[PDB]
């Protein structure tokens, strides 16, 4: 048996328990990473455009719940139908010492002025999927629609180039007045 050490590099797949799949886009140094006045530095930063389109409230609620859980010490029960109504974790989170809104004040690690807004920070449980880029990438030293695309653009030479010239090109001698291969 052979083991292979695998560090979460560029391209690996990550996904929370809310069908929020994503690929690591860039690994940014903690220094450039923005920090909250409380001292918190993000582990994973998700684009805010992947929330209102989809309708996954459970992920946000889970963030708040993980924040409360981290502060209080309770593991928090999120069992379906019978878990703390979100507004209670929101109302407890503050008395623990944090804005109800799940957001805090974050400072830009690059320039330095704090962003003129609040930043929703939470603790959501992400799962690493077995889709590692290490086993996806490979190179070599194209069917119907793939023909039709080159046709649409009009790249004939490119077609031949890909489907024949780089395989089994065979040369035969045709008679001019006969039509039969010589």
């Amino acid at each position: 048996t052979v083991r292979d050490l695998r560090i979460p590099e560029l391209g690996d797949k990550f996904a929370s328990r809310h069908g929020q799949k994503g690929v690591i886009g860039l690994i940014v140094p903690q220094e450039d990473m923005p920090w909250t006045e409380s001292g918190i530095v993000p582990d994973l930063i998700v684009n805010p455009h992947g929330i209102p389109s989809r309708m996954t409230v459970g992920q946000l609620i889970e963030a708040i719940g993980g924040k409360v859980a981290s502060l209080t010490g309770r593991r928090v029960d999120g069992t379906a139908f019978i878990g703390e109504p979100e507004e209670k974790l929101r109302k407890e989170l503050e008395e623990l010492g944090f804005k109800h809104s799940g957001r805090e004040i974050m400072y830009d690690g690059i320039t330095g002025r704090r962003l003129e807004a609040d930043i929703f920070i939470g603790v959501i449980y992400y799962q690493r999927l077995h889709h590692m880029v290490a086993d996806k990438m490979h190179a070599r030293s194209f069917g119907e629609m793939e023909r039709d695309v080159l046709i649409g653009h009009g790249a004939a030479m490119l077609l031949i180039e890909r489907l024949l010239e780089e395989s089994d090109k065979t040369e035969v001698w045709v008679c001019e007045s006969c039509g039969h291969l010589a």
């Binding site: 391209g11 690929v23 455009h49 930043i119 793939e146």
Partner: protein, 863 residues
């Protein structure tokens, strides 16, 4: 030196005899387990397949050696199964003794002249073919044999007859022999063949009756080693096996009948050789029951891939390629006077370093592998004319691909920009044409070799040359989500960027030195930069355009235009003047795909170098605004106070009792049925409309008691994944859950779930969620939503079947159609399908939303 045409026909005996390398006479194969070389069917000057080179004069070792044909002198003629019906259709349409087509002079004259008007359409020529057939088949008085009464033919599978006369009122059936038939087709002159389905030169009728059987080459009959003999060879063995017996019986004594039996047997065998799956012909099987698959069963029966990551820091036409992938994929570059130094340094760097190489091809053609040996003595007096396979360099032409490949925009030419790590980097605005996102999507990478191919891709398939989609008159490559949000914040009424922000961040684009940055519009509150002016620092100095923004609606529609028949006090109707952004805000209306009003204009007026620039610099512009200012969604963005809650509660109760009154009325048979639909359908239809009405109303209530000036709402109203249809579902209610149309009924014999009373047709009972994703779904609602949620899974995934198939059909129908140089769409058989394409001849990728030159726009351009 390439193929102009191919002209099919029928082989003459002479051809088969001349194109043969040797006459095959010995019915045997190899034999056996040692020494596979005979003198009839195997390599007797015919073809090579074993590691032994001997052949027919041409020597030509087993490696590379086009097979040679052979022949078989058939002891007797044999009807070709493929022509059987045609031969029949010919025989009873023409005259025996004569050779005429049993048509009057007049008929021929006007028929041929009706045959030239159809000389290209294969489908419409058969109508007249069979019509002619039947018109001749009815006659018995041909104009070229004093008429001698023609005994109608019979057929099948390969036998012919003629119900002749000799007695009187009799109708005996004289049998028909291949010799007779063939010699009877040899009388039909070249003049009559065109009136049929034959040729005087290409396809003579007599050739339909095989006199010589062409033997396939050794190369076409390869032996499938474990040896599993080839089927063709075996059946051939049987054919010669009978052929020789026949010839040997003809040369000796002739009891006639014997020769007839053997003749018909030979006929069977050839018939099987032509087609084993024939009709009326017992399939010649191998000793196992497994049928032999002959001829009719024979013609029948540099890239890379990886994950993708975003990169708004590379050019829109550029592609990020992992340097490891760049070190595997190589390009053929012939050493010339301009790259002599480069390539020598490349090959000297070996397969290592970064700008190295893996192979070298000298002019003789021998490939040299740079691995072993060393890059030392290899990289010597290369001289011009060699060829280096260097690793991928920044800028090389490369095709980027993401399956499924719907439109053409799925394969685009990119410029390699070699980077570490292990993913492909795609600039963000080029996501709509590929239909790619990120979650886990992987794409393909192609590396073309011949200079012609690379150029062609770089000239015609480059990203910048396809910002606009050919489907509709609009741009496909543009702002996605943050680009929209960033454009809004950058072009806002209150957009004042301190020097620190403007100065440091304009480096994400360019363009300043002198009369660009100037001069700080606002020093009122403080010396600062208006966002409109900063955005204005990109548009060229002559584009004046005006179009209403997304918010130019509701009672905020207004107007107050004023034509030229300068101050600034406007907001909605976006007004850009010579690069100066006077009024308006940037959103889905302003930038983004699909649209058709700004990005569209800068690509028509200034298409290649400018369009890419405006695109490239804008993303990085818009992005840094978003980034430096802070842009998020919290959980309180969808929260409504107690007041909105009580209001929604009262609304859902009202809708409930509305449905009950409908049910109580239905129970008592209080009729009131809808016109068209059935009574049971009336009840359902009325309820669905009643509840849908209430749903939209609840959502309308939700947009009031929620601050319309926070981040989330901006995105909804701006242009980054938005839709009021979903907003109602998140805050207010999801609504009625349906299954293929009707409500949720499929459950127990008397109800959906076991928590309701049998027959309960109430609102909650037939699947209606009252709560939204915020408040949370109840146990019932969660299940109902799951039943209704299965729809999207099934529907969206099923549509692929019909989409792909339908498209595959119409693709295989129109793939031949082109625009000829005379500006005409013609089918590949010279048939004018469309005099001037699209009526006007303007490419939809180049027209102003269907309009053949947007006249109102061109006129305005007078400054």
């Amino acid at each position: 030196k390439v193929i102009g045409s191919i002209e099919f026909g029928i082989l003459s005996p002479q051809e088969i005899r001349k194109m043969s390398a040797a006459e095959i006479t010995v019915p045997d194969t190899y034999d056996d387990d040692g020494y596979p070389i005979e003198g009839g069917l195997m390599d007797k000057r015919l073809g090579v397949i074993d590691p032994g080179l001997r052949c027919e004069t041409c020597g030509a070792r087993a490696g590379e050696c086009p097979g040679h044909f052979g022949h078989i002198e058939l002891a007797r003629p044999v009807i070709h199964v493929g022509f059987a019906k045609t031969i029949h259709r010919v025989l009873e349409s023409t005259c025996r003794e004569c050779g005429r087509i049993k048509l009057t002079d007049e008929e021929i004259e006007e028929y041929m002249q009706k045959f030239e008007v159809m000389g290209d359409r294969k489908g419409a020529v058969d109508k007249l073919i069979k019509e002619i057939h039947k018109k001749a088949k009815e006659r018995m008085v041909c104009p070229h044999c004093g008429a001698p009464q023609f005994p109608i033919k019979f057929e099948r599978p390969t036998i012919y007859w003629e119900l002749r006369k000799d007695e009187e009122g009799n109708e005996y059936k004289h049998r028909m022999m291949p010799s007779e038939v063939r010699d009877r087709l040899e009388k039909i002159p070249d003049k009559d063949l065109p009136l049929l389905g034959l040729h005087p030169e290409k396809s003579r009728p007599e050739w339909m009756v095989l006199t010589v059987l062409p033997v396939p080459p050794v190369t076409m009959r390869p032996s499938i080693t474990l040896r599993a003999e080839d089927d063709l060879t075996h059946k051939l063995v049987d054919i010669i096996r009978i052929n020789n017996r026949l010839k040997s019986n003809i040369e000796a004594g002739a009891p006639q009948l014997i020769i007839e039996d053997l003749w018909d047997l030979l006929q069977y065998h050839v018939t099987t050789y032509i087609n084993n799956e024939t009709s009326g012909v017992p399939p010649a099987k191998h000793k196992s029951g497994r049928p032999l698959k002959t001829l009719a069963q024979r013609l029948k029966g540099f890239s890379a891939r990886t994950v993708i990551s975003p990169d708004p820091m590379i050019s829109i036409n550029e592609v990020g390629v992992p340097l490891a992938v760049a070190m595997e994929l190589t390009v053929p570059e012939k050493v010339t006077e301009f790259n002599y130094e480069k390539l020598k340094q490349r090959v000297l760097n070996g397969p290592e370093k970064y700008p190295g190489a893996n192979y070298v091809i000298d002019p003789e053609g021998r490939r040299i592998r740079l691995m072993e040996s060393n890059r030392e003595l290899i990289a010597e007096k290369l001289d011009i004319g060699w060829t280096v396979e260097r690793h991928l360099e920044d800028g090389d032409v490369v095709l980027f691909n993401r399956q499924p490949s719907l439109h053409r925009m799925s394969i685009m030419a990119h410029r390699v920009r070699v980077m570490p790590y292990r993913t492909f980097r795609l600039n963000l605005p080029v996501c709509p044409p590929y239909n790619a996102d990120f979650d886990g999507d992987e794409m393909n990478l192609h590396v073309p070799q011949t200079e012609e191919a690379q150029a062609e891709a770089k000239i015609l398939m480059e990203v910048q040359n396809h910002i606009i989609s050919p489907r509709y008159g609009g741009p496909l490559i543009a702002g996605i989500q943050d680009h929209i949000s960033g454009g809004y914040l950058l072009t806002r009424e209150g957009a004042y960027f301190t020097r620190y922000e403007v100065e440091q961040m304009l480096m994400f684009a360019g363009m300043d030195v002198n009369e660009l940055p100037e001069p700080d519009k606002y020093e009122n509150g403080e010396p600062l930069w208006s966002g409109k002016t900063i955005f204005s620092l990109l548009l060229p100095d002559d584009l004046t355009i005006w179009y209403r923004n997304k918010l130019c609606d509701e009672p905020e529609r207004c107007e107050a235009l004023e034509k030229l028949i300068r101050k600034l006090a406007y907001d909605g109707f976006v007004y850009i003047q010579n690069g100066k952004l006077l009024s308006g805000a940037v959103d889905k209306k302003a930038y983004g795909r699909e649209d058709g009003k700004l990005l569209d204009i800068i690509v028509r007026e200034y298409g290649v170098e400018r369009a890419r620039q405006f695109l490239d610099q804008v993303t990085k512009l818009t992005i840094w605004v978003i980034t430096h200012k802070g842009f998020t969604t919290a959980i309180d963005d969808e929260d409504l106070p107690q007041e909105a809650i009580d209001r929604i509660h009262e609304i859902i109760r009202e809708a409930e009792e509305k449905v009950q009154r409908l049910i109580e009325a239905y129970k008592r048979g209080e009729l009131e049925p809808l016109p068209g639909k059935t009574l049971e359908e009336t009840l359902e239809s009325k309820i669905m409309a009643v509840l849908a009405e209430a749903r939209d109303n609840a959502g309308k209530v939700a947009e009031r008691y929620l601050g319309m000036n926070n981040h989330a709402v901006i995105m909804a109203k701006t242009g980054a994944r938005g839709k009021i249809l979903n907003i109602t579902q998140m805050a207010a209610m999801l609504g009625q859950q349906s299954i293929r149309g009707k409500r949720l009924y499929r459950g127990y014999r008397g109800r959906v779930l076991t928590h309701f009373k049998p027959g309960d047709l109430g609102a909650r009972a037939r699947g209606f969620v009252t709560n939204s994703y915020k408040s949370g779904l109840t146990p019932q609602e969660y299940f109902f939503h799951a039943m209704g949620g299965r729809e999207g899974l099934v529907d969206t995934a099923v549509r692929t079947a019909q989409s792909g198939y339908m498209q595959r059909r119409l693709i295989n129908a129109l793939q031949d159609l082109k625009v000829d140089y005379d500006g005409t769409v013609r089918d590949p058989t010279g048939i004018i399908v469309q005099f001037k394409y699209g009526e006007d001849g303007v490419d939809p990728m180049k027209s102003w939303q269907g309009k053949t030159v947007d006249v109102d726009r061109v006129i305005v351009r007078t400054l």
